[PDB]
Symmetry: C3
Amino acid sequence: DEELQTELYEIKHQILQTMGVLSLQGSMLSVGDKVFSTNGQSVNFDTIKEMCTRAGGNIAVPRTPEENEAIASIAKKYNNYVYLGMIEDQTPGDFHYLDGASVSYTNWYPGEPRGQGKEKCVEMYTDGTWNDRGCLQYRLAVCEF
Amino acid sequence: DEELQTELYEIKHQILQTMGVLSLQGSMLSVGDKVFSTNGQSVNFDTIKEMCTRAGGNIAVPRTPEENEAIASIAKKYNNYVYLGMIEDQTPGDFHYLDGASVSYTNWYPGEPRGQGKEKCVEMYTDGTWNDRGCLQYRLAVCEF
Amino acid sequence: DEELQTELYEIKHQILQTMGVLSLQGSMLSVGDKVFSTNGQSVNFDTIKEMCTRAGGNIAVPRTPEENEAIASIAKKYNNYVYLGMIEDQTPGDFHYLDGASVSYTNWYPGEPRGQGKEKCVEMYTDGTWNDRGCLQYRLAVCEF
Ligand SMILES: CO[C@H]1O[C@H](CO)[C@@H](O)[C@H](O)[C@@H]1O
Ligand SMILES: CO[C@H]1O[C@H](CO)[C@@H](O)[C@H](O)[C@@H]1O
Ligand SMILES: CO[C@H]1O[C@H](CO)[C@@H](O)[C@H](O)[C@@H]1O
Ligand SMILES: [Ca+2]
Ligand SMILES: [Ca+2]
Ligand SMILES: [Ca+2]
Ligand code: NA
Ligand code: NA
Ligand code: NA
């Protein structure tokens, strides 16, 4: 109806306002329909995952060059590597998103991955390239919503 | 209709994103349908009330164990007592929410309350238990929305 | 319908919560339907404009006394002048909003403006009054959404 179109207008305006404030202050990065954010903490994979799910999101994982660059800027900003939301399959060298799906977009640093199943996790260098590594290091916690 | 179901989807997704960012960064605590937050200030009862109403909320008051524990964690976090949204009735020993209703859930520290009408307000210890006290002390301002 | 009225209720409640948290923590100022916010940075006009548009908003411009006072408080808070969203027309002494429209509400400091076309921009003093100035100074970035 009409009164509905009005309601939805204010609602959408208010959401734009809150998101604008959050982005202006650098509390989050918006890329397409995905929002990235970090609590500034450096912890291991399992810890990061918990923090993200607890906030209603998931450990971040880039699926496009633009998403990858957004995460890289946060890593650069806090000057620390970032654990991405993906783990190695049974067959070494092969990685999958946590939902199980096979990884499509990748940005491995030349030569990577090369840990032969010893390094199940994936960390992002400050330049955005990836490196498979063990899941017990302390990495910047970056979540996506 | 259909286009409406689509609109509402993005709107709900965007709200989840902003709330997720706010919770991930510890700017707020979500418990059920209630959101708690503090400006980090330590002021008296009347001041806190003003700050909260000015932000569009109310001075926090726990009505369930989970809500009580959420507030307690903030008190613990800032290491300071928290004034709760409730005041003593005419009959000492009896307290009511600011809307007038009688207090149901309580978590008095053993022996409390025992100020015999001299202490109209209620402060929360860092362990979550309550103590009736005067309303002129400087306590962490915690609001609920 | 009914289920819709319910959906919209939670949505509106959640927006109030996020906006309340943001205002309680001083991350933004709400005046009517306008929200003001600053990233705390001091840069020139062109830079500010970019930062604001990038966050989904615009460089702030007061159109009412209340809006003017809100911006002034931010300037006072960060103790710095604020560039407003307006520039001088061809005819010196005349200013227009960036959308082109003619400026209606004004709050020039006594004697201002008086740069005779040499100062195309407008800066706000910490007391809220305006002064036309060059657009190359470093001013607090305040955006409106
Ligand atoms: C000890 O090996 C480390 O360095 C190589 C090359 O940098 C990485 O591939 C590996 O995952 C470890 O981070
Ligand atoms: C001086 O009394 C104080 O201590 C007792 C016991 O701790 C409280 O009950 C009371 O409200 C005051 O805080
Ligand atoms: C050098 O002139 C400066 O001071 C006058 C008066 O304060 C302003 O009008 C002008 O824009 C400049 O800021
Ligand atoms: Ca490796
Ligand atoms: Ca007492
Ligand atoms: Ca001037
Ligand atoms: Na490996
Ligand atoms: Na009492
Ligand atoms: Na001028």
